[PDB]
Design a binder for this molecule. Structure first.
Ligand SMILES: [Zn+2]
Lengths: 93, 50, 116
């Protein structure tokens, strides 16, 4: 199973940035430079970063290259602790 | 200990300690709400660090 | 498929059966990429409103469901690539639940929120 990495994102642009990343993946899916990340999560109340599921940080870097909203997250992504990995998808009400 | 003196004009300028306590209370309230409601604890962590 | 991707951020809705997220206009034009064979909401705004909800929390962009933990946790690993909600508020009408069951389609609530 892959890991999750946090990537700094322009505040308030998390959903738009995720949508740009899927459009990029779809555009490149039949090329020789596909995205190797596994998912992106933008939790309802998270501000200033997104979560990306991938096996390698280098895959994250390559996927997020050129994404303006992630320019401040291009050089460093932080791994989500496995024991806290399910918390990413918790939605309390 | 942190008198808010007026600058050359009329706006009340706050002391450095006042500004720092303001930042402390901002992150403290943010963390308090993030623990009152399930915030995935990642933000809770980062918040405690800040 | 690019057609699956939400065209904008206004009037987003989530399918109550699979959690796929698209705009109301996209649901009207193309139906649900996953459920439209069964729900048949294409061309019927009322059916879209019946099968989708504007009240949802969080989203999950699922591209490779066959190689993701998130897709397993969310029970969407057998669905098409697309945007999905973390939790969806609402319930399919009893008639739709009954017909799904009569057609072998089980319905498990997509509301994953911890309530209190
Ligand atoms: Zn659906």
């Amino acid at each position: 199973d892959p890991n999750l990495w946090t990537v700094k994102c322009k505040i308030g642009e998390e959903r738009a940035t995720a949508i740009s990343l899927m459009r990029k993946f779809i555009a490149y899916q039949f090329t020789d430079t596909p995205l190797q990340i596994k998912s992106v999560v933008a939790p309802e109340h998270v501000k200033g970063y997104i979560y990306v599921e991938a096996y390698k940080q280098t895959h994250v870097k390559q996927a997020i290259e050129g994404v303006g909203n992630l320019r401040l997250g291009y050089w460093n992504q932080q791994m989500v602790p496995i024991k806290e990995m399910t918390d990413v998808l918790k939605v309390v009400k | 200990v942190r008198p808010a003196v007026v600058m050359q004009g009329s706006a009340r300028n706050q002391d450095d300690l006042t500004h720092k306590l303001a930042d402390i209370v901002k992150i403290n309230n943010q963390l308090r709400r993030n623990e009152q409601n399930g915030a995935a604890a990642h933000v809770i962590a980062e918040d405690v660090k800040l | 498929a690019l057609e699956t991707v939400p065209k904008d951020l206004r009037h987003l809705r989530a399918c109550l059966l699979c959690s796929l997220v698209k705009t109301i206009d996209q649901f009207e034009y193309d139906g649900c990429d996953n459920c439209d064979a069964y729900l048949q909401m294409k061309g019927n705004r009322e059916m879209v409103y019946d099968c989708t909800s504007s009240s949802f929390d969080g989203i999950i962009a699922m591209m490779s469901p066959e190689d993701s933990w998130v897709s397993k946790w969310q029970r969407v690993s057998n669905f098409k690539p697309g945007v999905y909600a973390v939790s969806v508020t609402g319930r399919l009408p009893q008639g739709i639940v009954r017909e799904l069951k009569s057609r072998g389609v089980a319905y498990k609530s997509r509301d994953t929120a911890i309530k209190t």
